[PDB]
């Protein structure tokens, strides 16, 4: 909804947004949204996501598709009216994104999703990119393990000419929605096929905000499907735009740069990553 | 409405237009339109705004959606006819923009919205743009607070990979509508996802006049995403075209340039802003 | 309808076309067509113009929309059949443009509209253009007053981020119809939001002929919103095409070139305008 | 239909095609097709031409629009079946072009339409073009008179910002069809607006063959709506393609070059034209 | 049908393919397909070809249109099923191309169509192209006669501004169909208007295999219309792709180069043609 | 479905993926999946593939089209629901690709298909490419035989101007289904007419994963029909994207590079092929 600020309450927000990244316990926002989600009544819509054609499918708190749902209105703090209605398997009325308030007054945050190797990582969408083919898949899985910590991470597979990979977009969003509803660390390998359809364009528009709001992290591979000259800057600008954090390869082998947005209007942080391969191409990220 | 002029009546119009920026009381046009709006008969449609489809949703004075409206007609001074009709939650007959006359004969103005640090600021649309990653968000919020003055400014958030950010265009225009109906100073962060659907084209075309007519100011953020080089003045001309004012960053860190259209056929004024950051990235615009 | 000529009738025609610009009293064609229009039996459709979708709407001589009109036909001298039928507020049968004969055997004329500064001005479409942001709005009004003479000039406002400006194209066409139906001298500010719908393409293509047929002049400004550089000539060839006259700025402040088409296959005349600003941006074109 | 040839009958065709241009009496093919046309039974379709949307309207030998026509089949010499059926004002079944055989065995000709100043001119489509604005309108009307000889020529007017000019495409094809049905020399001023819609594209595809088959000449103005550099070669190649003859302006004032296709696989002829202006811009083409 | 090979059966296929161009009797594959076609049961659909829409019209052995056909099914050697169904004059079920098996196991051939001047020519599609205005029409007719030999060649005429030239795409494909069903040597003049609708794309994609399967040759004319410079090998690669043979003009007046695909995976042969004109532009290709 | 991992399960997976290429018996994955397929209760849908329009068609294990299939669901270990429903010969509910589980927990594999010349070859999609017209068709067949081993290889033919080649895309997809359903080694000649429908885009996107899932190899040739120059790398990045393996020619006659993806995130292996021609263009790849 819309918010109102004066000098004093704006400073409080920025302090709150600062705290959501810098001082909160890693992963506490996810735990908090898990709570909001499970306090939602049986069969109530929680999430709508655009399919290939541009229609939206709707999910409940158990990641189950909502087939039919009688029109229902909710009056926000703002006067704002949210209408949800699902018919014939598709949202007749409503908006894409979370259909329940997960964030409240606390908007424009990059909730800290994890802490690893001395750095805090934001939730939201993290694009792993950089110059042509040199180890994007191994790095996302190593980030997934690292940011997973005590928890297993979720792996969503799409559009690679390898065994067991889904290539149907509608199955992809079903995967993604389930991943965001039930896990804090998600890996997408890869967005290559999404880059266009109205649902594909909707995905790049929504995934970052959905994740950030849930307090989960989505780490997605992005090979620039263009040349050796430039377009590591112009596909990277359909990235840096829709991304909460960017992870890019450097001139030095094994080395990556992380660029994080720490929240609305806050300073971007940059830090450096060293990695190396073990057996069966399993990549390790170095800590100390 | 079309209007007719000779030398004499045209000269009076221009004086009226000049006064509306230069000598009128800051924020007085807003107060006046507030009176026009509340004295309007109960149930009257007052504002129509394009949704993604290009269809138009319709609001009353309290920013409530108008679901069904029996065809009413109004005869203007020209002898021209204004027709509004709303059905199944969508305008069946009418035009985009205000449905009730706020301006009468007094058109082509940039009514003064606010005074600050020795400068008068225009109502209408204010695009904040320039060379990338350079502090657009902190600036729109500082200008928001500053021009709000005694009043809290409204914040419309859209299209960003942060928590609580709506990404559904149709919710966005519902936010826009509510803001202009109910507040003099409004902040949109950001226009990034609007820049194309028919609704997005309609928003760009309309908002500036909607705001100027109301006598409210809409301060919108805009990063050019196409290049780091020369598309700081080709997407910026999709700006200066649809903008009542432009605020662009300069060579000097912290410095911004304001370019103001002061009215129809009138001179464009320019002045500079000096800024610095406090804690939690809260920006201040310097005075005297 | 098609016309036939040998050497002799062709020579009479050109002579008559020549006369319609050079020797005919200024404004006389307008008066004549005002005669034909008012002596039409009310109810009759007189003008059809395309809306945004591409369908047409039909007006009578008092610039009222025609909702329903029972099929009627007229046989031309040609042996060709003219047909008009209106249903549900849209033209079921017919052509865009004038629906009653205002001219006669007399086609391909630029009927002299006004006389000022020792120069005759053509009716039809006048595009005011040239290098970026440099005095267009002031000039169209200065010109509008000067050609107005003893008469007030009509101002149609469209798509500017200023107060009271309609930004809905459907309303725009309605303003144009009424203006051409009721006034010899018309100003459009601005042609920018139209420059493309099927309706916007239609307006570009029809307005000139409509105006020249009526004997009124439409004075419209065209800011070349593309580049500083070489697209001062390629959107100006979107002008040079559908303009009866061009009014283009020079490299000398306050100075303008006027390019006039004096009629079908006749010579193009050029002359210069000197202007200066008074109080509140009111521009004067210098005379004697 | 399809034709079969061996060496001997192919040589006979070429001799016949040669004769249709070089030795036949000017205008005799037109007279011949006039005959075929008037031997057609009452209300039988003779000509179908594409409208704006791409549907086709149908005409009879009197240039009257055929509204309803019961399905009818004709068996050609070839085995080929022609089906014509008109419903609701539009051709339900059939093809664009002539719906009756005007040419027979004698195909691929440029029938001599006229003789003037010692040169033979072909029927078909003649595009008058060349570098930017210098006298295309006066030349088409002078060609019209010249090739008209003893006969008046027909003038079809379209899309110029001058008085009495039709700008509706559907009226344009109605004009054109009537012109080709009832006259040997036609002038179109101008195709500028047609250059795109499916009916516009159909026109450029069909007009040449329709005319050539009728033995009438269509002389159409074509201002290259592009630049001063080139595109007097690339708009000229949407010309030289669909044209039977081309008439182009040279470096020398008043001078034009005529390039004629004399028939299928026959040699192109080039000759030169000198012209000068008299009073009221009436152009004369010099003979001796 | 899919086919299966090992080393041995593949080697036999290639020998079979080699023979089909090099040692088979010229024109013998055509005679064979003529037998397959007439021994087909009465009323059987044999050929389906795309009309402008992309829909397909259907013919029987005598090139009669098939209006209505009860769903029939045929089980192939693979176990694959071929289904034909025709309704309201359009194929409701089936594929484009031949509907009856002309080739069996013998596929990937360029069956020898004709012998002339010491060279064997391939059936399939032959595009005649190269540097503009250079004698494409006289050449396709000379090659037509030459390769016809004892037999008359068929001429399909399309898209030219000459008398008797069909311009309706749907008639064109009816001509194409009749030609291939009924004659070994076919001449199309010209492909100019096909080069895009779905039908035009279908024609380009299909005709080459249709012709090669039948064992007929289609000699089509093609002037590149986009440029005088380098698009003699970028529209020519929309040629060499869809062509079984290429005939291109050279530096030397009268000289042409023939580039022949002799079969699947086989070598491309090249040889040159010398030509000169007789009377009425009748061209002769030189022998010995 | 989504999979979960910690460090330990991830390491087991990569090990298993490694095994599926390096140590597993060649062809063993195919045999397994042939097991799963035949042990499916007939009537069951096993494969859905998109036709030209974008809708999908569904096959059973004997590569027969499924016309009607009553709604059935399956619950995954994930908790996600799989659903298949076929109506009127098209898939009403479900995804493109395999409709029964052929893999297991085992995803992201390039299952070793064959062994030849001291090198293992991956199942999935193999694109044969490189500079213009230079031995592609011979190579795909040479490769097809070599990987065939004791088995015959399947040849799908499409869109070449040669005898017996299907050029209808709908038939093409049908050939592919049957081939993948019944054979370990498949050849496509050619991928040219597909390189775009919604179906052609779908085939590009799904074939690789289909093949790798099945354990068969599809060997397809891609002539870069664009340029001689720099588009040997941008349509090759339409290859590098959806290819399991690449086989690209060098500047040395008869020599080829093989680039293999050995599985998800694993190393890419490169090796060289020497070939030579025998009688009738039959190519051999050299061994020991
Ligand atoms: N042990 C290793 N040593 C060096 N490079 C490796 C190793 N394992 C994998 N790689 C590289 O990492 C990449 C694996 O990820 P993949 O998805 O195939 O490509 P990418 O993710 O870079 O687009 C390959 O490019 C491969 O060359
Ligand atoms: N205290 C600070 N010191 C320096 N730079 C800052 C500070 N706070 C914010 N910024 C910069 O201002 C921008 C914050 O706004 P953001 O939305 O991230 O980008 P944009 O400039 O596109 O609005 C960032 O580019 C960030 O680096
Ligand atoms: N007194 C003045 N002296 C010089 N220029 C002026 C004066 N008043 C207005 N202008 C100019 O006239 C223009 C106002 O017209 P506007 O509609 O903003 O742009 P356009 O030139 O496109 O019409 C501005 O460019 C402004 O600089
Ligand atoms: N008497 C004349 N002397 C010189 N030029 C003339 C004369 N009359 C007309 N013209 C020129 O011929 C043209 C008239 O035709 P028009 O339709 O206006 O342009 P065009 O046909 O060249 O596109 C004008 O460009 C005009 O300058
Ligand atoms: N006897 C001849 N001598 C020289 N050139 C000729 C002769 N006959 C025809 N031509 C040329 O051959 C061509 C005839 O074919 P046409 O369809 O006009 O052009 P295209 O070369 O595009 O097929 C023309 O370019 C013409 O100049
Ligand atoms: N004996 C041979 N020696 C050399 N090249 C050959 C031989 N036989 C065939 N070729 C080549 O193989 C190719 C045949 O394959 P084709 O399908 O025509 O083209 P592509 O290279 O696109 O597959 C031709 O380029 C031809 O030059
Ligand atoms: Mg990857
Ligand atoms: Mg910002
Ligand atoms: Mg202006
Ligand atoms: Mg002209
Ligand atoms: Mg030709
Ligand atoms: Mg090949």
From TrEMBL, chains A, B, C, D, E, F:
SUPFAM superfamilies, sorted: P-loop containing nucleoside triphosphate hydrolases
Binding site for UTP: 136-137, 192, 277, 281
Entry keywords, A to Z: ATP-binding, Metal-binding, Nucleotide-binding
InterPro entries hit by this protein: P-loop_NTPase, Packaging_enz_P4
Residues that bind Mg(2+) 1: 137
Binding residue positions for Mn(2+): 137, 189
Binding residue positions for ADP 1: 133-137, 223, 268, 277, 281
Residues holding ADP 2: 136-137, 223, 277, 281
Binding site for Mg(2+) 2: 137, 160, 189
Stated name of the protein: NTPase P4
């Amino acid at each position: 909804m819309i918010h109102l600020y004066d000098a004093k309450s704006f400073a409080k927000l920025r302090a709150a947004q600062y705290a959501a990244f810098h001082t909160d316990a890693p992963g506490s926002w996810f735990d908090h949204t898990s709570g909001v989600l499970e306090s939602v009544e049986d069969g109530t819509p929680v999430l709508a996501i655009g399919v290939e054609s541009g229609d939206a499918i709707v999910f409940d708190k158990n990641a189950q598709r909502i087939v039919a749902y009688k029109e229902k209105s909710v009056k926000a703090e703002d006067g704002s009216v949210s209408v949800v209605q699902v018919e014939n398997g598709f949202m007749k009325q409503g908006h894409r994104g979370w259909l329940v308030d997960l964030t409240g007054e606390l908007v424009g945050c990059s909730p800290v999703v994890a802490e690893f190797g001395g750095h805090r990582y934001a939730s939201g969408m993290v694009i792993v990119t950089g110059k042509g083919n040199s180890g994007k898949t191994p790095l996302v899985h190593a980030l997934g393990e690292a940011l997973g910590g005590k928890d297993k991470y979720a792996t969503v597979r799409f559009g690679e000419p390898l065994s067991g990979y889904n290539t149907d977009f509608n199955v992809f969003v079903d995967d993604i929605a389930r991943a965001m509803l039930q896990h804090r660390v998600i890996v997408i390998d890869s967005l290559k096929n999404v880059i266009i359809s109205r649902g594909a364009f909707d995905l790049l528009s929504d995934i970052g905000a959905m994740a950030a709001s849930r307090g989960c992290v989505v780490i997605a591979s992005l090979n620039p499907t263009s040349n050796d000259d430039c377009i590591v800057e112009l596909v990277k600008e359909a990235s840096r735009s829709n991304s909460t954090s960017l992870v890019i390869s450097t001139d030095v082998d094994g080395e990556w740069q992380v660029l994080t947005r720490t929240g609305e209007g806050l300073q971007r942080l940059t830090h450096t990553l060293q990695t190396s391969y073990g057996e069966h191409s399993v990549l390790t990220i170095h800590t100390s």
